[PDB]
């Protein structure tokens, strides 16, 4: 499936390169015309990057699932960007992982996305 993502410091970008599924970094004008999974990072207090919120206003109809990169140091706010997005647009949280993710996170994500393509 197509993955749309946003990465500020390179971690989400590193993760997506472990998938070799096709993936694109979001911008302001970007329109996505097919079913897709969003991977976002998490900004302070468990929040959603503004660029992602703006994107999703225009592209939420085809959104099929969201994963978040964060850091478990944030406790209950760990990857809570995915919680906010999931709730707002009624799609599943695919997965949460830390930073550039581990291999188990990569496999987990791949399995979940298959499952969800059902």
């Amino acid at each position: 499936m197509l993955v749309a993502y946003d990465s500020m410091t390179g971690n989400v970008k590193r993760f997506i390169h472990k998938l070799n599924m096709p993936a694109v970094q979001i911008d302001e004008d970007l329109v996505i015309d097919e079913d897709f999974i969003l991977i976002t990072y998490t900004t302070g207090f468990g929040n959603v990057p503004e660029r992602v919120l703006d994107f999703l206003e225009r592209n939420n109809e085809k959104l099929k699932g969201v994963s978040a990169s964060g850091n478990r140091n944030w406790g209950d706010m760990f990857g809570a960007s995915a919680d906010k997005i999931s709730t707002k647009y009624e799609v599943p949280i695919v997965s949460k992982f830390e930073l550039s993710g581990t291999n188990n996170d990569v496999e987990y994500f791949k399995e979940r996305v298959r499952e969800i393509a059902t």
Partner: protein, 290 residues
């Protein structure tokens, strides 16, 4: 001579970090720790000693990062908006240091507390560890510094921020995740959230400088960074055996040290070098519960 102008961005991230530092601002007065006494007295003597010893060490690292690290790194930046964020972060390193004293003055008598501080000041592995880090900072005590010198001080910084503290942060989290000393635990959670973003920020600045080094300097600092990583890991294993053998937690702490080392590396845009393992679940619970 230039003054800081925020209406012309010097980079694409300092403002967000400026703002998040301030949003995160807290001080010890906000968290009462008196209620921890109920669980404190149920600990064994050995547990009590380990906790105080680790708080000692945490206080040392925050002291040096606020008093040496942030000041000597920031003085040499040309990016004034980044300088600003680093000054604020250094102040927060002192807020943290003081928050450890606030914990101590419930868990211990004045005499016990001063004994811990004397122990910290005379402790050879702590001297060694803090001395390796601070030697990168004290190299910047001259008018002009090379990009390599500045890069390596920033590596040292991120290693302290994102890695070296965690042999100590382990214990308050571990106990809080068992519902013991949860007030003191909440303070440590606030500290860690600050430090986490400190590590990210300084890693960003480091990557900027790396991108400017020659291919040969790049190879040199890559080697120096791996050496420092592993030298520090070796000292941390000696420190964890000292502190935690008495309470049977040495390998758990060592695992947690590796887990955070890998995070510190990624903050530098670098590959993990220790085996990937999940976080200690009790520690995780200490991070969550509030």
């Amino acid at each position: 001579m230039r003054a800081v102008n925020w209406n012309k961005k010097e980079d694409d991230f300092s403002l967000m970090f400026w703002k998040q530092n301030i949003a995160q601002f807290w001080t010890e007065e906000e968290i009462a720790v008196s209620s921890d006494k109920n669980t404190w007295v149920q600990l064994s003597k050995e547990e009590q000693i380990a906790y105080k010893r680790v708080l000692g060490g945490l206080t040392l690292l925050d002291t040096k990062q606020g008093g040496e690290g942030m000041p000597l790194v920031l003085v040499h930046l040309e990016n004034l908006q980044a300088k600003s964020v680093l000054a604020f972060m250094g102040a927060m390193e002192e807020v943290h240091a003081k928050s450890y004293s606030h914990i101590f003055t419930t868990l211990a008598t004045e005499e016990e507390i001063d004994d811990i501080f004397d122990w910290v000041d005379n402790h050879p592995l702590l001297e060694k560890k803090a001395g390796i880090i601070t030697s990168y900072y004290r190299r910047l005590l001259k008018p002009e510094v090379t990009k390599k010198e500045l890069y390596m001080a920033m590596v040292a910084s991120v290693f302290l921020e994102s890695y070296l503290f965690y042999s100590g942060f382990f214990y308050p989290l571990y106990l809080a995740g068992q519902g013991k000393l949860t007030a003191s635990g909440e303070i440590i959670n606030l500290i860690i959230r600050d430090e986490s973003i400190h590590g990210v920020f300084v890693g960003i600045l480091a990557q900027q400088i790396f991108a400017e080094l020659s291919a040969e300097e790049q190879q040199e600092v890559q080697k120096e960074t791996q050496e420092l990583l592993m030298e520090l890991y070796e000292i941390e294993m000696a420190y964890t055996e000292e502190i935690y053998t008495s309470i049977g937690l040495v390998e758990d702490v060592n695992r947690f040290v590796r887990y955070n080392a890998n995070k510190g590396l990624m903050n530098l845009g670098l590959e993990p070098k220790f085996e990937e393992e999940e976080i200690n679940p009790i520690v995780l619970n200490g991070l969550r519960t509030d």
